[PDB]
Design a protein around this nucleic acid. Sequence first.
RNA 1: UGAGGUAGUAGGUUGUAUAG
DNA 2: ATACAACCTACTACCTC
RNA 3: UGAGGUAGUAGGUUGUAUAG
DNA 4: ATACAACCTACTACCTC
Lengths: 251, 251, 473, 473
Amino acid sequence: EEIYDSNWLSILSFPEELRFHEYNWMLPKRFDVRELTFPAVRYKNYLCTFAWAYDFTYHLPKTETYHKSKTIRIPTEEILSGSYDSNFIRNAECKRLIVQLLNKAFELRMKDKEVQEYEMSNKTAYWLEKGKLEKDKFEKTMLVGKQKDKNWHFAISGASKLYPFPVLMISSHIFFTADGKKLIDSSSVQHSSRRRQGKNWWNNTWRTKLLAFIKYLSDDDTSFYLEMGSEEKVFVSNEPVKFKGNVSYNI
Amino acid sequence: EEIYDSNWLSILSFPEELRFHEYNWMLPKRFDVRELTFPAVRYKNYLCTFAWAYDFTYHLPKTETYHKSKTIRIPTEEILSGSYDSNFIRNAECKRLIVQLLNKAFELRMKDKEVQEYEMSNKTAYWLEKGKLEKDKFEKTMLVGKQKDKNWHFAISGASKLYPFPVLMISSHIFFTADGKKLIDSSSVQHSSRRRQGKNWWNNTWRTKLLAFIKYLSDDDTSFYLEMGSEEKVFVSNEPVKFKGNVSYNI
Amino acid sequence: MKELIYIEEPKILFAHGQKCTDARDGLALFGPLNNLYGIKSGVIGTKQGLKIFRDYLDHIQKPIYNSNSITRPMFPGFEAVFDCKWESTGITFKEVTNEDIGKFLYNSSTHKRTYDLVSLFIDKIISANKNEDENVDVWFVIVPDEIYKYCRPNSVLPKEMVQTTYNYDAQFHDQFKARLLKHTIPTQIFRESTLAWRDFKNAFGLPIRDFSKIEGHLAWTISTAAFYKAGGKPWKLSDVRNGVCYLGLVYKKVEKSKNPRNACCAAQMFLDNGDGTVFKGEVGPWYNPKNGQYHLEPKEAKALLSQSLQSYKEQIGEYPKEVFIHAKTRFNHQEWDAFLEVTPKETNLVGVTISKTKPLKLYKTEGDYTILRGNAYVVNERSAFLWTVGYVPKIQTALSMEVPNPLFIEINKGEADIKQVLKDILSLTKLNYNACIFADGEPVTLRFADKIGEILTASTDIKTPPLAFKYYI
Amino acid sequence: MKELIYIEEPKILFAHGQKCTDARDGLALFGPLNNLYGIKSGVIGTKQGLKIFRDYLDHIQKPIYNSNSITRPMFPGFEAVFDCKWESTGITFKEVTNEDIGKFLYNSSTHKRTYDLVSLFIDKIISANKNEDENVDVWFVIVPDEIYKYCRPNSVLPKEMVQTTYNYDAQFHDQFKARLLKHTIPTQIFRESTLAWRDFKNAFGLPIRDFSKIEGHLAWTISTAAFYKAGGKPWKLSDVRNGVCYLGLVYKKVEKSKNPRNACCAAQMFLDNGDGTVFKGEVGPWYNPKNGQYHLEPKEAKALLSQSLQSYKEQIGEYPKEVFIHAKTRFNHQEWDAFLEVTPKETNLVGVTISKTKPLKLYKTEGDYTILRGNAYVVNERSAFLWTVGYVPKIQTALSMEVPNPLFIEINKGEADIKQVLKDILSLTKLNYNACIFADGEPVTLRFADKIGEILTASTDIKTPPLAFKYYI
RNA sequence: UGAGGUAGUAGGUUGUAUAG
DNA sequence: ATACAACCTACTACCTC
RNA sequence: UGAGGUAGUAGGUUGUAUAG
DNA sequence: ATACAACCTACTACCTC
């Protein structure tokens, strides 16, 4: 019997209701929902979010006269189980909405903790600045180190999924800086440096760094939270999903 | 040193002159020169022959008033050597005329000696009748024999040529009869019988039969003659051309 | 804590009816299935390049030792492994003069230079095949290394050395093997650095392609490819169920014609009467319009499946009892209805999707080693993860370098049994005849279908391509 | 009494650089020139016919003895003679069902039945070549004997057994080998009586093709053809002068198109750099209008000779110093001027006419045996008779049955030396790779040109035919 | 067509020559 | 288009290596 | 392309949703 | 045509068997 540590963080809890607020005219069309403080997706004339009705007042002063009874809040447990499906919203496209909300919440939460950001081809990764940590070692495993003239940093990227479980998959990456603060602009240089650094990163060099970064993102001893709204929080476990294999081996 | 017997009979002599008689109107056009007693070829308005001017009187009563001075007789030695060539006649087509004359003379001479005739695809062959010879054996070699119900006969075909020498090439054949007088009409049957009979005819079975047939055609101890005309005769040696090889072998 | 099952390592069959997990160890001790009396090799290239091939073939004549025999078994020599005479004497040489190979190389246009370079070799190969009495099993084509620098897409030619067809691929290998398909000539392309490399040195002085530790496996793969191309059976599967055709589909882009046209190529594997294993291409390439469809229309799906079923019947006599279609891409309902229309009542059709995209990685609790290969997390009766790339003790390490990504196997269509599907894909990952490795990270139907597609998207003027793999791999 | 010279028997070369007059004795003791590790044989035909081929190949595996070893040397077995493994195990079998072979046979039309019969075999051969991993050197095609009765011109089908394309020859063999030329597949056609014949019996009970005395030479010729078709060098000439190309032309009729079109085919032989002997076809078939012309127009003569000279230069580097064109037919001035226009100043062009029509027969004075082979009566510096068919002591008899006809060799064009011309034609009469005999009665250039013409007048749709002889003979 | 050899059929062309 | 001589191929039959 | 593996780029499609 | 999620191929770079 062998226990394996995955890169999937369990999503411990969800807000009781997924809300669709009928902002309509109160929401100007020529406005991006990304500048909203809390995650939200413009679906039809509804704003789909886990937040409260008046959490977007600062960005939307015209929503001060919104009526709460126009919300079509949904019992998220039905969404995840699959019970909810109708003409207004489909279970396939209602679970995709929550994934977008969770992804945007993860991005905003990473922005909140002041971790430097590097854009990839498709995703975005969050690395740590030289000097942000105490000597750049969280827990007992170093996250930021040196390699010739390049300061290397450990970065992670998050992506919420609901198919096997409600989980958050994290991908690990290595990034490089010329001075420890500014990122090298050459994609080829970064790729070559990442390959060189990963040449000698074995199982426990990746696993420990991933778990250390996750524990850094933690807010208590059991999980961290993504801020759905002023009152709603999604709790993502800082302990990744563990798998138990019935066969193992030794050196 | 080994001596070989060929199938070529040397042409010992020719008439002194190849004549072209200007028969013209005296020769009706709607008349074939094959019924003439002596060989002749209609070349232009001339009749090419080795014969005398009035040798064709019986078949051509209208030639009784022919003038001998109209003949353009040619010194045959010049023809064979190659000296003679002009607009009237070409050396290539003047030697072909003599070959035709010699071939027709051979056919007529074979007709004269009363030898039975069998037509092939292209040539004609002269075989001997059952009972024509004394017990059907000329010299000491049999020419006509039996094989099952088929009386087999030895036949020869002649063809005059002038290229290597003035010679007469003779080809040997085996023919079959149902009763000894009439010829089997099936080509396949004759071919199969000829193959069966020749299966066991080796060198001396062919050579001796060929020489015996030639000696039968002989008129004296050294040659025979083809009748060019009432006074002109072509003498063909009955002894074939012999070749001497400097290498031999033994059993 | 989620349960994680483990599929037993499939066993492949060798000579004398023997079994072994490792292809290299099975060949080294038990030998290949069939008897090839000898491999008559044709070598085309520069006279300088002929010397390299002769020296390397003499090298592989003798047993070869690598750095760590436990991790990578040593090479016992060609004639000892494949009991086949592949000598350096009796090779048919076609010289390529350096002047000729340089005249077309120094060209601004990559497409024209690639076409001319391919023609320079294939014309000599075709002339040798047709108008010569020598018999050759495989035509080993040696190319220089500056050619490899300046004969493929996105190869910027240096300006100082510029001296001086667009309906073909700008890549040498794909066009080369595409234009020889009419003549059915098995060929193997060798870079001058892939062969004797110690001459090729960088600025530091070490060889750029330094294989000082890995001569044994290099020779293993080279010899296995040479044996397969000459008409040999290296090994075969032993766990194939009766009446089961497999088929695997891969889609490729074609830039030659407007719209990528999404050519679809299939590779068919099944069992033959007796015990023989049939594994060939199923190539009728069915081109798909639209820029990113990657799905087959009903007509082309019907044509593909009818061709596969007819090919199975023509060799066994009755239709397959169960078919397991593989694909990198998910099947939609239209093409599956098209497939089922052709499929008879008895045959069971299963559509399986195989992908590496899912971001799952199991890091073991302790130890600088990755997970065992063959572990499977069955998500549900229709979906699972399977670690085709992982640790196996016999190779002494894991097949990957970093933490590997598992294969996501989904029964997109049909019913199937998930454990049986994972049992067959793991078996399929063994029969990689192009590479003499322990096992492949992807099922062989998908990989060889991808190779077929890569070669046939290079030539527009192909017609009735051969179904034997030796003309592509 | 006319003088009669004798050309010395030419010597052919064998392995280890050995010489011998007899091809059979040279192969039996010294072996062939090159090393073929093995012959992988494909056998297509009825399952009943497969048994016959297997039994016959097992027969020729062991040494074979004939009636009189002095006249016809015994066969020492395939592997002992050609040091090549040609076993009965490892043959790739393609069954032809009796129902299929009968369905098309029982047809009124000879052309359609011949086309369908040829297709029934060639489709299987092509499919096996393309879509199968097995490697085959020669495809041995076995046909029944009723087929041989009812598959060729002027074969009247019996009325009681009638049950049921015209652009092709009504003969099975010529069309069969014509339609396989695109794929370059060496094939050997075997009648079921040519193979094990003791089963086939006539009314008397004796075998119709009774070979009780001649098993040895039958096996000799079969094995030599099989070795040549697989890519082997049985023997080579040793008296070929440097810088001498030969070429031989033969004209054939084509009934498919209106007017026989008098296709002309050539076979080119010369010496290669070093000591190798080059002997292949020179096939660009140049069709001749008019019903009985048998002469080449200036354009086609120029094309033929330019192709031959270019083929010589492409292998040696410089043009031939002397060319000896052979032909059954006399050359006229037009085509010879056309030939000389292409010919450079250095090259000497000679046009030789070879015919059997001249009615000369030398009967020796005493003894039931014919003249020695090699005797020549030089008529003059431009014409001679040469006895290619005659007595030679080593074979213990004469090559003919009745008194043979000598070859009439005439230097129709050019200058040449008559004794040298007779010395080369006698040498050419040796290299008959289709027949393992002491010597041929006709120069091999003419005979193989005739075979090429016979095969290529069967298919109208041919294009760039192969120049290797193994695809025709 | 495993081969080579020797027949016998069948047709053809060229070159002339005279006639339709 | 008929006759000839001197040159041509395609096909069937038997015999032999 | 002797091979397999792992990255990082680049582009694309489908499904929705609101706008031109 | 813009945003997203969940699915797709083509290409270059390094490392390793």
